[PDB]
């Protein structure tokens, strides 16, 4: 079981080799693939803002503060991405690792801090 800092927890179900994972035009590939259907009902919007902000942090070379109740502006954070050479939405062109074919849609990919929960399958 893993989890992000917004309380979005899940079970590792599949592990793929390197040649089987999706990759972007610049070769970026994920460590984790989480389902977009985990978002709309749980409304964990701070996890998506963290991916937006941290994506520009990594290219800038900095660690910033995202404490609760500080002033935020998702419009101005999304313009920071464009200033760094990325798209406004933080989405990229991706390819299927198994066939080599590109999706007809840009994929939202970026860094999100995750945790391993101490619930081990070998013990249960």
């Amino acid at each position: 079981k893993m989890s992000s800092r917004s309380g979005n927890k899940g079970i590792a179900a599949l592990a793929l080799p390197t040649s089987d994972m999706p990759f972007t035009e610049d070769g970026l590939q994920p460590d984790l693939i989480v389902n977009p259907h985990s978002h709309p009902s749980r409304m964990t919007n701070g996890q998506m803002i963290e991916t937006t902000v941290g994506l520009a942090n990594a290219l800038q070379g900095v660690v910033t503060d995202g404490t609760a109740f500080l002033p935020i502006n998702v419009q101005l954070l999304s313009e920071r991405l464009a200033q760094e050479g990325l798209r406004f939405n933080g989405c990229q062109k991706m390819f299927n690792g198994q066939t080599g074919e590109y999706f007809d849609a840009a994929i939202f990919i970026g860094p999100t801090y995750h945790q391993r929960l101490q619930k081990f399958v070998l013990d249960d």
């Binding site: 970026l28 994920p30 070379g61 900095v62 660690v63 503060d65 860094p111």
Partner: protein, 80 residues
């Protein structure tokens, strides 16, 4: 307990520059602050210094994963 030998995500060998990067980052942040006590320097203020061009000078590419793992990894020798 150290910066990993390779990037966790792609496998680029970021660990051949880890020692140089750590020392050079220390020197660079000290230059940017200008000789202040380690406790009188806030943790937040030193993390806002841009290390883009230092990492570029090490020869490490512009990959999101490699710079993330080179910049954020905690060092056990500085906590124990």
């Amino acid at each position: 307990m150290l910066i990993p030998v390779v990037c966790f995500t792609c496998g680029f060998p970021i660990g051949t520059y880890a020692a140089i990067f750590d020392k050079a980052r220390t020197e660079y942040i000290k230059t940017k602050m200008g000789g202040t006590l380690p406790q009188n320097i806030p943790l937040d203020a030193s993390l806002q210094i841009e290390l883009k061009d230092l990492i570029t000078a090490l020869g490490i590419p512009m990959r999101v994963c490699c710079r993330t793992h080179l910049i954020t990894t905690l060092d056990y020798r500085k906590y124990y």
